[PDB]
Design a protein around this nucleic acid. Structure first.
Ligand SMILES: [Mn+2]
Ligand SMILES: [Mn+2]
Ligand SMILES: [Mn+2]
Ligand SMILES: [Mn+2]
Ligand SMILES: [Mn+2]
Ligand SMILES: [Mn+2]
Ligand SMILES: [Zn+2]
Ligand SMILES: [Zn+2]
Lengths: 368, 184, 368, 184
DNA sequence: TGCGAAATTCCATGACAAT
DNA sequence: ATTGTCATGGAATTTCGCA
DNA sequence: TGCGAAATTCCATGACAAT
DNA sequence: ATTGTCATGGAATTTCGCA
């Protein structure tokens, strides 16, 4: 601190202080004449308090803090002391935005078979139609084939009623859903265990994970809107119509409709395809198994110029889900326990519970 | 002529009245002719409107080219005829007093009544809740003739609920006694 | 229709029907054997009804409509008839999303002088603090220098009270704002006309246009949040502090604080810059005029791969501002009267009022 | 010694009491020494707390190195001394009975009282509303000595409200008569 | 073994959202 | 204890029809 | 007239929003 | 009758200190 500064005054070289400068004394303060002008060199022991006063004026980042300091002072490697402080300002760490993007999305394999995996979700509330406010949407992962049920609430009881009707047809291996009360209830867990159905859940606040069904919700609302143009929004009676309509619509990338992927043959609907009229059912199912295995599958896109991928042991922060007014958007730093895949991690939230969490809801903590 | 296919023809009929289960009294039975796949819908009456209501559910998933039935009142009404015409479905009737369909369908229909009877006994009022598991059972039942279950023929895959125990379907000593009790 | 089809049956060449195919008759229908199989050729007079039935099943786009039709029929140039129909389906035109992005943003010149242009806006509602719910934010366009006023409502009366205090210092040439009730009231118009102040308004629902002040709102909320961490959100007393703090914060890209751009010299605040201590005020103001003119200015970024720019006479559609549930997101097509600049247009909305409108709130109508 | 600068020194003082205007009775007057820029704040009393309240507004825009005043009670209180110390502002007093400042400031202060008086007369209760236009007037008034207005010296630009009419400031025949009426 | 036009494929854009 | 998706309509690319 | 390290500059990312 | 903006912190680039 003032020892180092002493040596310097009589011209003896200290590492970090360039020799070619004239380090003098005046007004009780060690100074130096620098190209930018004359700056005070504070002793080591004063520097952290200085960096803190400057940073605290407006809780500024690296450069904006440095430019304040540099108005009065010079010392070796100032930004290192600045960065050290930013890395310890709790208020900055939990309030600032990230400037690193998430790594590129995964394109999970399409389920091998119809009934391997259902994606379910609620749409609503919609305008009341015959007492109904919500639509339960069940999408078969392999085929895209979708079932629709009107409900009065997005409840466990309504869900169970609907799936009991649906599962009359077949039982699926897995049902994937989000963390809505209706799917996370112990009652619904029992309903599925009773049937050998495994429940799979999305990481919280990350509807991309239920992307299959979210995307179908879009087509559902779009067709409903169109059919209701210039009529009152009486949508209850259109659900069966929309269900059938979408199940028999071609995906241009696939050249198949979800109905075709499910049954391998069109039923008695308009413009039914007739290309397998001369095949036996067995030959038809044979061609169907072939068609199923060779469907187009998208590949993971390029990483953006400045993305991050989680490493075990990294300090990261989870987004606050529903932050109140004038409150931080981020939680305190926590540590990556396990990298489940490059887009999904388990973190120890320094309470500490284990949370499984999407990297879209994480930022890497700045300044190490 | 071209090979038979699912959705070519649906055979439909009512079963009942049964003891009331949650307000319901009949079962409308639909069997796809090619596959032998069965759908079941509980109704409060064997009427045209209960039929239309139930078939409107089924025909939201898949539409038959032909529906075959007997000359039940529900199926011969002009309302039911208009409903089918609207949907491009041709209707087809067995002659009165001469029920006819196919071997597969007849046997399928036999199984359905037997299995119901078998589960009715002991809890004759709880059948509404059992309708789902009944269908899975029927539809994951191996066919002697075709070498596949209806499930496999309809979807082209094995199911997640194989019914490995091709069971009795015949009533045990106890049930005969207590179904004789119920019918008293 | 059936005339053209007649000629074809006896082997006489019709333009559009490839000669090398065998065009026969069967079941009363003209057919043709095509590589994909045997298709019905409907007469010209039946085709529009066909394309319409196919399209209407699920209001599908070009390919998904074509794949339906092609199951039963073949005729010359089918997609041309398909596209003709899509271009006339009102329900599709007002319900579908665009797949063309807006052209690249403009980076308008920075106002030449302090007081040339103010950008104003409200923040709130905030948690109540001493009866106050909102903050009036006034940002000087040239300097970034910002004034803050607490209000009980975002009203014309509160605005006028605050600007009467502010305009005690100086009167600005222009005040730019959005279309909030407080700024579009006739009373506020009078207040400005009385002072030689010209009122400028953003295109509706396009806060990018008030970007200068929106961006400042962000820094305001960010510093407020930080200063209130783990205290109750009593923000009223912090407004003066935040105002001063931000007005004296360096922009790293500029190397100046808004205070410096306004006065050319730091007042008595922490870490005041002292580089012009030996200049006279006149020399200081001279250097200030120089600094003002040479500030970094960003350039318009590259257009995305698939953007559109408005052309006079083009059919375009304005986004519905607050669409009800299950209602279209777009208005009916309207025509570009005038291209004010490549991001701003006047449209005749086929009522028809003239509306000045951002292209971010427009899509070009599909299928010409 | 180094050239004088804006914010180097603020001269402050109270004017009043005046007729009540919207509840207010005094004007706190702040004049920057280098530029002659004037800020005015209406208060209900010439107290430390009204002073602190008003200066807290001003010092949210810019902080003087020194405040100069007379030995008014508002300015010599220990509360006011602590307020300035908290803000790094040095306080500076003219000796009692011997008011002193600068030529520019004195003249500026003269203009302020005259202009007020001039606009008070005829509407002595409406001055609160006039405070803004008064400041623009003062601050866009050309200085004989320096060749610039306070506005120009403070901001380094011309203003959007030049006050091209360097006016009377002296009372017309009518006003002398009716200010003599008011003072009765 | 090549040309003009039609057909098909490619693919950026945006909207579904969420204890 | 998990993970984005896919209809859309101009454009880019391939194929078709003919010679 | 070149090297290692420090300083500066660059710049993708995201958040402010809106009758 | 108008129009995006700019703090942030790793990375890329330039400059500094020395010889
Ligand atoms: Mn949900
Ligand atoms: Mn019968
Ligand atoms: Mn606003
Ligand atoms: Mn006095
Ligand atoms: Mn959802
Ligand atoms: Mn805003
Ligand atoms: Zn901080
Ligand atoms: Zn349409």
């Amino acid at each position: 601190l003032d020892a180092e500064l002493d040596q310097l005054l009589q011209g003896h070289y200290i590492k970090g202080y360039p020799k070619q400068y004239t380090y003098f004394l005046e007004d009780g303060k060690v100074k130096v004449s620098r190209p930018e002008g004359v700056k005070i060199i504070p002793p080591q022991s004063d520097r952290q308090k200085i960096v803190l006063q400057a940073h605290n004026l407006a809780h500024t980042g690296r450069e904006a803090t440095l430019l304040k300091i540099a108005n009065l002072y010079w010392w070796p490697n100032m930004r290192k002391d600045v960065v050290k402080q930013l890395g310890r300002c709790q208020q900055c760490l939990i309030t600032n935005a990230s400037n690193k993007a998430s790594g590129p999305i995964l394109r999970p394999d399409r389920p091998q078979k119809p009934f391997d995996k259902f994606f379910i979700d609620y749409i609503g509330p919609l305008p009341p139609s015959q007492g109904y406010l919500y639509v339960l949407v069940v999408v078969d992962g392999m085929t895209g084939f979708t079932w629709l049920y009107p409900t009065k609430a997005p409840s466990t009881s309504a869900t169970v009623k609907s799936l009991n009707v649906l599962t009359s047809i077949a039982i699926p291996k897995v049902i994937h859903s989000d963390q809505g009360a209706a799917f996370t209830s112990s009652t619904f867990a029992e309903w599925a265990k009773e049937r050998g159905i495994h429940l799979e859940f999305s990481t919280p606040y990350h509807p991309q994970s239920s992307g299959k069904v979210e995307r179908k919700n879009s087509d559902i609302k779009r067709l409903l809107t169109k059919l209701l143009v210039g009529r009152p929004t009486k949508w209850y009676d259109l659900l069966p119509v929309v269900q059938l309509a979408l199940n028999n619509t071609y995906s241009p990338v696939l050249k198949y409709t979800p109905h075709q992927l499910l049954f391998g043959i069109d039923s008695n609907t308009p413009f039914a395809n007739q290309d397998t009229l001369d095949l036996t059912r067995e030959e038809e199912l044979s061609l169907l198994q072939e068609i199923r295995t060779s469907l187009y599958h998208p590949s993971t896109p390029p990483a953006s110029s400045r993305s991050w991928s989680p490493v075990v042991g990294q300090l990261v922060q989870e987004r606050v889900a529903r932050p109140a007014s004038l409150r931080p958007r981020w939680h305190k730093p926590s540590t990556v326990l396990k990298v489940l895949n490059p887009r999904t991690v388990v973190i120890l939230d320094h309470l500490g519970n284990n949370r499984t969490v999407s990297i879209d809801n994480l930022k890497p903590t700045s300044h190490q | 002529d071209r090979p038979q296919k699912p959705f070519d023809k649906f055979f439909i009929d009512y079963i009942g009245p049964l003891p009331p289960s949650q307000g319901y009294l009949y079962v409308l039975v639909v069997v796809d002719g090619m596959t032998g796949f069965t759908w079941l819908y509980p109704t409060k009456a064997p009427s045209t409107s209960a039929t239309v209501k139930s078939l409107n559910v089924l025909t939201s998933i898949a539409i038959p080219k032909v529906i075959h039935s007997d000359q039940g009142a529900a199926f011969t009404s002009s309302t039911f005829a208009e409903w089918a015409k609207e949907r491009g479905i041709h209707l087809e009737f067995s002659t009165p007093y001469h029920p006819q369909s196919s071997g597969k369908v007849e046997r399928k229909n036999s199984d359905i009544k037997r299995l119901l009877t078998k589960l009715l006994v002991g809890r004759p009022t709880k059948w509404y809740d059992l309708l789902p598991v009944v269908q899975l059972a029927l539809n994951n039942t191996y066919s002697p003739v075709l070498k596949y279950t209806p499930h496999q023929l309809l979807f082209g895959i094995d199911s997640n609920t194989p019914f490995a125990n091709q069971d009795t379907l015949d009533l045990t000593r106890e049930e005969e006694l207590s179904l004789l009790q119920e019918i008293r």
